[PDB]
Amino acid sequence: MYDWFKQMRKESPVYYDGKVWNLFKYEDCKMVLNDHKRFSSNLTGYNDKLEMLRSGKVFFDIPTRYTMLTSDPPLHDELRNLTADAFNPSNLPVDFVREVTVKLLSELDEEFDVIESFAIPLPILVISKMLGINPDVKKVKDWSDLVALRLGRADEIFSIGRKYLELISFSKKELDSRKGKEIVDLTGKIANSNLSELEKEGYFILLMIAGNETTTNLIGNAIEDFTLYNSWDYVREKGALKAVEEALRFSPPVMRTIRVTKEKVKIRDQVIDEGELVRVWIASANRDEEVFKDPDSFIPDRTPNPHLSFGSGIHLCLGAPLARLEARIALEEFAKKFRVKEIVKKEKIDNEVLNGYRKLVVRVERT
Numbered sequence: 066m067y068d069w070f071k072q073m074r075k076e077s078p079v080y081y082d083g084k085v086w087n088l089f090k091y092e093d094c095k096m097v098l099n100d101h102k103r104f105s106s107n108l109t110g111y112n113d114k115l116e117m118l119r120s121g122k123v124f125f126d127i128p129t130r131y132t133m134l135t136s137d138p139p140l141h142d143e144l145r146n147l148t149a150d151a152f153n154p155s156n157l158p159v160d161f162v163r164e165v166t167v168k169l170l171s172e173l174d175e176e177f178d179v180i181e182s183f184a185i186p187l188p189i190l191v192i193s194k195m196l197g198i199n200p201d202v203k204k205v206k207d208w209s210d211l212v213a214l215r216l217g218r219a220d221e222i223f224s225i226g227r228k229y230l231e232l233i234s235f236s237k238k239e240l241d242s243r244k245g246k247e248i249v250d251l252t253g254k255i256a257n258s259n260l261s262e263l264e265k266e267g268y269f270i271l272l273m274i275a276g277n278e279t280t281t282n283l284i285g286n287a288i289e290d291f292t293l294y295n296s297w298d299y300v301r302e303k304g305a306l307k308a309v310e311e312a313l314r315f316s317p318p319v320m321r322t323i324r325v326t327k328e329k330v331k332i333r334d335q336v337i338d339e340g341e342l343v344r345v346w347i348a349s350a351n352r353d354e355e356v357f358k359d360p361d362s363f364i365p366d367r368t369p370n371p372h373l374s375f376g377s378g379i380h381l382c383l384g385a386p387l388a389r390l391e392a393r394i395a396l397e398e399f400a401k402k403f404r405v406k407e408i409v410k411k412e413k414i415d416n417e418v419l420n421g422y423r424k425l426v427v428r429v430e431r432t
């Protein structure tokens with residue numbers, strides 16, 4: 066995928082495939098992501114039916130159509146601000162994370178799968194913690210793949226199956242709980258808000274899932290990258306702050322984004338009429354020669370590192386501060402306790418916009 070980008074970065078930054086536009090240039094990308102006035106995120110008719118929905122009307126539709134993720138201002142501000150200050154560094158359960166993470170490694174054997182044994186649990190253990198719920202890790206993971214693994218796939222991203230209704234009823238049940246208030250759970254806040262009934266169900270599923278899957282991929286990626294390019298030592302003594310950041314740029318969980326135009330736009334020599342999709346490639350951007358010196362090299366201490374892994378602008382991953390945190394503690398405790406001796410085998414997540422491993426086996430020996 067990267068050779069293509071490098072090529073597209075040179076030959077054609079603003080490319081039009083069959084029906085969607087594509088940007089591979091950092092500059093073009095960043096600008097577009099910060100231009101919510103023209104490049105909108107209203108891709109599910111969320112804003113459109115905000116009046117109809119708030120009027121109390123109720124129609125059947127997958128709750129995932131209505132998340133702040135696909136909403137434009139000012140509705141966005143309204144949805145994001147409700148639980149935005151909960152994900153600020155100061156309000157992060159840094160303790161919980163460290164304790165659940167340390168336990169997570171308490172008995173790791175000589176050859177285990179870091180994904181299904183560490184990468185998957187932590188995210189879900191934590192987001193649910195903040196979420197104020199606590200179900201089956203396998204259950205949540207199932208619901209996550211169900212939602213994520215259908216990303217990018219043109220229509221199977223709005224379709225409802227049986228196991229999906231299980232996700233819907235789950236949210237409805239959990240939600241119904243928290244009302245009566247005395248808020249404590251992030252879920253708590255959600256239920257008791259002016260939001261329409263299904264908006265609540267969308268916001269709920271949005272934090273539970275958008276949390277873990279991408280967060281797990283980041284740690285799986287980091288572990289490989291840190292091994293392939295030998296960065297473990299550096300981690301043990303200097304920390305994981307800058308490294309965690311290199312992982313993001315070099316091996317991003319979210320390979321790209323998409324947006325629609327509200328007016329005619331002209332990015333470079335290419336004009337784009339309104340009502341068109343614009344695939345914003347974060348991965349390509351992260352490797353742009355114009356912005357990163359020796360971009361195709363992995364540098365744990367690489368700085369500056371203005372990657373677009375978490376996005377940019379007003380939709381900048383709301384869980385960004387939490388992920389870096391979870392990322393840092395998992396890798397340092399892992400780096401502290403273990404010493405990777407080799408990457409035995411690995412299976413990639415079958416998805417084109419989610420860069421990650423579903424299984425990553427490693428041989429190790431305790432310090």
Ligand code: HEM
Binds near residue numbers: 272319376382384387
């Ligand atoms: C761990 C690696 C993670 C990555 C790489 C990542 C990446 C991204 C990206 C690229 C976007 C772009 C949204 C848009 O501009 O199109 C986004 C949005 C969002 N992310 Fe993440 N994310 C991660 C973890 C998390 C976590 C852990 C949570 C919550 C626990 C979370 C919550 C959100 C939310 C709510 C949004 C939507 C923000 C809004 O629209 O204002 N993310 N994320």
Ligand SMILES: [Cl-]
Binds near residue numbers: 225226227228
């Ligand atoms: Cl089904």
